[model samples]
Target: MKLKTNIRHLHGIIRVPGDKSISHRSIIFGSLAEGETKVYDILRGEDVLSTMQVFRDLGVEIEDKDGVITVQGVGMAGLKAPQNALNMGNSGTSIRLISGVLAGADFEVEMFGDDSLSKRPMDRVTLPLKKMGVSISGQTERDLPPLRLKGTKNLRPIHYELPIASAQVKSALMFAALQAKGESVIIEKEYTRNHTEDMLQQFGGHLSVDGKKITVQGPQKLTGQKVVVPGDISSAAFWLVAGLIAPNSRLVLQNVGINETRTGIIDVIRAMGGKLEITEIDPVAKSATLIVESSDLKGTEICGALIPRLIDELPIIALLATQAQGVTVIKDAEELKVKETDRIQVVADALNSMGADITPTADGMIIKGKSALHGARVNTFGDHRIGMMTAIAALLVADGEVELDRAEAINTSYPSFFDDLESLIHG
Candidate 1:
């Protein structure tokens, strides 16, 4: 993908894509319920499709015509053992959370995925499911993929504490907890996305959250409901950064999900002193319209609990930091080391290749900003956010013809990313 470089402005109103996390969870809860669950504006990405396909393989009837999706759920006891190993594709969320959904079954199932998924750590959920009597295993000490699990209906309830702030792991255990014989208590290191909990309630399932703690009452059943997915804030983040850094730019982003945990990018933009405004908020839907314009950005520290809230947005945030006035330090995000690729290193290396000054730390990276960025060819390393971030950063590149390798990786989250970007560009 050859990138358009040295853009002076970005304008026009645009919608990104549906929230990928919620899209996946909508499928999850939809399939587990006894009636038809109607999903509107679900992300049509490969990752979410992996979850859908696995459910189809597990005997749940799913229909997709146009952008509307309907899942005829199988209830708590209705899911069948798949005829073959579940192919998880490149979704870490699908594999990890699906493992919990497959818990408490009186059968065996194996799950695997593509090369990138094979490299992701599975021990995060594998160990916890083991305690609940779901015999699970994978390769290597970190438990790299191709996981196999033997399920049992007499699953024991667990009281466990999360070592990291991963919604995947927490949600995985929550799924298993729903099938456990008794009440299960799970605590988080910090708050992560609450989509799973949100979807659970929307499906008429019961769970309790107190501060960082979540408790699930088990063997619960869910009834499907209508779900309208809001546009992904993570996807909107690219335009936010582009609007802030590109001179003479004004972008009106519409109907973006404003779920509290996922709005860290908005906070970061405000903290960096970027010109942003919010309006047309739907309190029930938890979504709003965002307006961003070109502004002089300043460096700021990003750490603590806020790390989990905006973890996926950090790469573009790093690019946003590049145009800032001072040094930007991103810490407590060691989790970045384990994403689709090692995002911390990949972000630092890629941005540095473009002439930005960046130092990669174990948890996060320290970025010295307000540098004139330019680079030649770059790679996405098969990470979608990396693919999109480089494309946006290229808008500031005044040197070298920048071509992106593995541009198709963006299909994992936002398929129309380039279309949206092209619409926002000025001649």
Candidate 2:
């Protein structure tokens, strides 16, 4: 699909979709908990839908209507073995986290996904689950996808420390721990998103956290409850960066999730001297309403503890960095290599093609700012974030249009992205 620059300014009051991480976990926790779980403002993207579909295939009944979803839970002992191999589509979250759930089931199951997901390493979750006495194997010794698992009713609890910082892997182990016989202790190298841990407690599970260490007691009963998913900050990130770089732009973003662990973009923006104001905050929801206006941005250093907080927002941040003064250095984000695409390379290559000054590195990138970007032919490589980042970069082009190949890939996360962008433009 081809998208061109049509907006001189981006200003509007808009609300993005529900948090994808929270949405995926809401259905998973809902399915595991007993009774009915009602979820409001669930993200309707393909990835979250894949999670809902996988749970259904495991024998949980799910009803999604409008923005509300009702999941009829069957308890921990209720999932039936799917008659056929479960196709996870393009969602890594579904395949990894569901493996943890299946690790404790009393049946054998197989899981797979599309070409993009197939290449992602699965050993991160599988190796740990195997330590817990779960019989799991993948396509090759390298632990690529098309995984087969023979679950056992008896699961061994494990004390393990993560080799990398990953919310998915942590959440996967947490799911498996819930069905184990004893308490499982997990230590993280750095704190990632805690949606799984939070949702576990919300659904009535016992878990304790002491900084980077988390403990979960297994074989515990969980009861379903109503959950309201907040607007995704990851989705809000595109507009945030655009609001800063696009001339004369001021946007009112509503009810954005402000989980402290996931607000690195806010900090980065502030460091760049962007004009962002928090108008209202809902302490109970961990969300807030914010207004952002155009500002003269300066380069900032991003590394270490903050990397996990805004890992998903890096591609767009790279775009924001291009319009800032001086140089922006990103480090301690080697995790970017294993995503849907090698984002470090894709983000740099995609932007540099349009005249931005960026140098890709093994861990991250070094971007020299204040370049006037031009429209270019870009390929998304079937990665949703790459597609959205390129589209946003196209908006700042003074001449020509951005011809985006496979632009439809954005449907995996934000189906209404272009529509929302158009709304902001036409307004």
Candidate 3:
């Protein structure tokens, strides 16, 4: 797809899709609970659809019409073995978290994914599940997917210290711990998304969190309940940056999830002196309305604890940094190397193809600010975030056409992203 320069403004109230992380967990937890689980505003993206399909393969009946999803709970001990291998599509969350759910079942199951997800490391979840006496194996010594899992009733609980601050790995352990004979403990180096933890409790499971430590007791029954997934802040992030960098722009994003654990982008934008305002906030839904306008942004150092919080947003953040006044340095985000693409490399290389000054490092990247950006042919690497970031960056290109390879990659997380961009442009 070609994006010609000349998008000088973005103005309108746009609602992004539901949180992908939360949407995945809602389906998993809902299927595990004992009643009918009703979900509203769930993301109908490819990744979430993979989660829905995997659950359906496990005999949990799911009906998704329009946006409301109804999942027939199979209970903790109620899931049946899938007749065939479960295809997780391009979702690492589905494969890893479902591996934990399959760990305690009395059946053998195999999980595989699309090319992108097949390369993600599964050993992070599998190694710990193995410690709990769950038999699981995958492709390589690194344990990449196409994983086979054999569940046992003689599962044991484990005490684990997470090597990285990953919500997926932590949530998987939490699921396995809920089915173990005794208590299981997990220590996180830094806090990631707490959607799994929050939804676990909401589904009637008991768990305790003390600082960086989380504990779950075994053999707990969870009851299905209503879940309203707020619009994803990660999806909101592109517009936030777009509104700030694009000239003469004012954008209002409605129903954006501002959960403290996931609000790193908001904090970073505010720190960079972007004209962002919280217009309205819903305490029950834990969402907020945000209005952002064009502003002069200055680059800031992003690293340490902030890395895990805004890891997914770094690609777009790097684009924001390019239009800032000074250098933006992102460090301690080595985890980016293992995502759908090597995001550290992809973000830098893709943006540099469009005339930005980006130096990819082992951990993160150094982005020089105020570069004269021109249109160029950029590659998405089939990563949704990279595709969306490149599309947003096209707004700043004034010289020629910004041609993007594999633009449809945005369907993984945000199917209507281009439509929403068009709305903001034409509104």
Q: Which candidate is the best by lDDT?
A: 2
Clash pairs (backbone) in predicted model 1 = none
Please list the residue runs of candidate 1 whose C-alpha ends up more than 4 Å from where it truly belongs after superposition. Answer: 5-8, 114-126, 135-150, 282-285, 332-387, 394-412
Per-residue alpha-carbon lDDT of model 1 for 317-421, expressed as tens digits? Answer: 989998899999988777543542277788888888887699988778898959888767778878899999999888888878788999999887787888888
Could you list the CA RMSD of all candidates, in the order they appear? 3.7, 3.5, 3.5
Better of 2 and 3 by lDDT: 2
Q: Give candidate 2 misplaced runs (Cα > 4 Å).
A: 1-8, 112-127, 130-133, 137-150, 279-285, 333-363, 368-387, 394-412
Residue 333 C-alpha lDDT in model 1: 79
Residue 368, candidate 2: how far off, in angstroms?
4.1
Error of 1 at 153 (Å): 4.1
Per-residue alpha-carbon lDDT of candidate 2 for residues 228-326, written as tens digits (9 for 90 to 100): 888989899989888888887899998899898999999999999999999688764578997899899999999998987887898899898999999
Give the poorly placed runs of model 3, Cα more than 4 Å off.
1-4, 112-123, 131-150, 153-155, 163-165, 279-286, 333-383, 396-408
Clashes of each: 0, 0, 0
Error of 1 at 368 (Å): 4.7
- What is the TM-score (0 to 1) of candidate 1? 0.83
